[PDB]
Design a protein around this ligand. Sequence first.
Ligand SMILES: NC(=O)C1=CN([C@@H]2O[C@H](COP(=O)(O)OP(=O)(O)OC[C@H]3O[C@@H](n4cnc5c(N)ncnc54)[C@H](O)[C@@H]3O)[C@@H](O)[C@H]2O)C=CC1
Length: 223
Amino acid sequence: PLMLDTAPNAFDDQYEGCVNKMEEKAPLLLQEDFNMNAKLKVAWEEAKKRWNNIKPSRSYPKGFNDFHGTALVAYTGSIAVDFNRAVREFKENPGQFHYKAFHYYLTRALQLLSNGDCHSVYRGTKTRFHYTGAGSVRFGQFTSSSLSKKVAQSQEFFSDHGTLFIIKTCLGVYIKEFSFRPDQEAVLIPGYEVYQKVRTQGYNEIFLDSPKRKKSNYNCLYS
Ligand SMILES: NC(=O)C1=CN([C@@H]2O[C@H](COP(=O)(O)OP(=O)(O)OC[C@H]3O[C@@H](n4cnc5c(N)ncnc54)[C@H](O)[C@@H]3O)[C@@H](O)[C@H]2O)C=CC1
């Protein structure tokens, strides 16, 4: 069973007041991440190819470059697990975080694609989540969900040993056009969104409501 709280030790940078400095420094940072993260380099190289094929079909927000595009495509890939893990356990040993550029770009991609729009999404897991009554909740790590409750429940993401999150998000972004899917109608939620209303139903259902955007514990850490 995993703990569901405010994610106090999760790298949650929102980059307030430093996107310009990051867009300039992130390119070098990505290289540094690569030199010490083979899996990421490979994951990224593959995502870049897919991105090239996706890019022509639609137009993107002003400032949405290939880094943003590639990062988002990669996330819907297999690099997602190790990346969320690295973010979730950041405070532990913050010296071994080789997703400095990656985190920024994915974070920026969602902000550039973000609107005021709120959605009703669902997320399934095969690992039981226990709300530890902090008062509110944040996923910490980026979290993917689906507009389809049926998808979140499919044997692909959920099981009796797990949990089904019923979430109302307002920072979440519809990334169908980016995923390798795109039938899972995925909505990517930043780990820094705060749910002021938490409710547990039965042993495997958790409702997250009253989404709000509050400051993060980290800000422009690598700017
Ligand atoms: N889960 C869903 O309902 C949906 C998933 N997807 C896609 O499926 C693929 C996999 O997504 P996920 O299953 O969400 O993988 P994910 O990266 O969230 O899974 C991370 C894993 O690490 C562990 N973990 C997660 N949070 C933790 C925490 N707070 N504390 C301790 N351990 C934790 C668990 O084993 C968890 O399954 C991605 O491409 C995702 O976008 C798309 C639509 C819906």
